[PDB]
Ligand SMILES: Cc1cc2nc3c(=O)[nH]c(=O)nc-3n(C[C@H](O)[C@H](O)[C@H](O)COP(=O)(O)O)c2cc1C
Ligand SMILES: Cc1cc2nc3c(=O)[nH]c(=O)nc-3n(C[C@H](O)[C@H](O)[C@H](O)COP(=O)(O)O)c2cc1C
Ligand SMILES: Cc1ncc(COP(=O)(O)O)c(C=O)c1O
């Protein structure tokens with residue numbers, strides 16, 4: 001077989017590549033990723049985020065629901081992710097529907113963060129206009145005295161999302177410019193509907209094929 | 214004044230930050246960026262690309278129009294860009310309409326690339342399904358003999374786009390977690406329609422304001 005893969009379960013293939021990036025001393029945050037969202041009407045936006053957990057259920061991350069990305073996901077729950085590991089000449093793309101994580105789950109995660117991080121989430125109405133940087137500094141100092149020795153409650157607007165993967169591409173750059181692209185997508189006729197000459201069977205309902213660079 | 218800026222023209226502020234990233238030995242490709250596009254119906258996608266020129270007119274890059282991103286830009290000419298410079302703890306976001314570059318302009322740029330790069334563009338119908346990596350290697354070797362000592366013509370489907378900026382955000386990370394976000398957007402009532410208490414005047418028709426992190 002081999003098209004240079006560890007697993008035919010894309011999530012398990014991601015785990016192998018992720019571990020390698022984590023293993024690499026030249027990569028600062030291997031879980032740093034770019035999240036692409038858009039309005040229903042077709043207006044895209046994108047920003048860096050940190051992946052906070054992954055498994056069969058999907059890719060998890062946290063943000064403020066009232067942020068610009070949050071308003072977009074809530075009105076049009078679809079997203080794409082891009083992981084780029086320059087020292088490895090690798091790129092991973094993930095496409096799928098997104099779902100809000102349960103409250104208690106966000107709670108547990110929220111209180112596992114360092115206190116200063118929790119307090120930061122309470123001061124900032126993420127992406128709303130503010131007058132200046134001093135406004136943040138003042139509000140932050142005041143909330144630190146309010147919560148001295150106290151537990152910081154999670155804002156109602158703060159939480160997580162999990163993106164269930166429908167498409168996952170592994171891009172491996174090559175000096176000759178003929179990059180390797182192996183893309184997985186979930187098939188509809190799973191059970192046994194043999195497909196195209198160039199389409200292969202992956203684990204579960206996953207199908208994979210090579211894409212020209 | 215100062216909110217830590219070099220220019221009130223966002224394109225000129227980008228130039229200052231870009232130069233710094235270029236100046237940094239820990240950044241491999243300072244012009245590497247993530248391009249976010251989407252279908253008209255609201256389905257986003259994203260991938261890494263290289264910025265190939267910028268100025269008042271916009272941000273320029275090249276790709277195959279028949280690629281997945283190309284079909285998306287052509288049916289819904291709007292995009293977003295994300296530059297992330299980890300060693301500088303900086304992020305730059307650009308939102309705007311996109312326009313295809315003129316043919317002759319793509320021609321000149323195409324022939325300035327190294328030959329192997331030009332030939333690579335002729336072999337690959339970017340993002341179309343292929344059977345395996347050998348298929349690319351064989352086709353590439355054959356096109357090298359066809360073009361030995363000959364000029365490689367630009368494929369009809371290969372070209373560039375320029376994204377004219379409507380929104381540009383400068384994100385500067387901070388250890389205390391109170392990141393600085395200064396976002397520029399072009400105003401409609403340019404000439405003199407004084408705005409919100411927290412909205413300021415930038416060069417030309419540009420307006421700027423701070424956003425909570
Ligand atoms: C490396 C990196 C990681 C980040 N991680 C997160 C994160 O997990 N959640 C978040 O809300 N913002 C995160 N941010 C900040 C976002 O890029 C963005 O400024 C913020 O979420 C507001 O985006 P929006 O205005 O599109 O909603 C991170 C920035 C960088 C540079
Ligand atoms: C750092 C980097 C730079 C890249 N630059 C470009 C580029 O300028 N143009 C391009 O077509 N693809 C470029 N690619 C490849 C794309 O990420 C992608 O594989 C290709 O354009 C097909 O994307 P699409 O299927 O969404 O259309 C680059 C990849 C990396 C990792
Ligand atoms: C498909 C593709 N086109 C273009 C580029 C870079 O542009 P250029 O070869 O003109 O420097 C890359 C870089 O990785 C690429 O993967």
Ligand SMILES: Cc1ncc(COP(=O)(O)O)c(C=O)c1O
Nearest residue numbers: 050062063113117126386392426
């Ligand atoms: C606004 C924001 N939230 C969260 C994070 C990172 O997540 P966490 O603090 O839970 O590790 C970042 C990292 O830069 C961020 O900018």
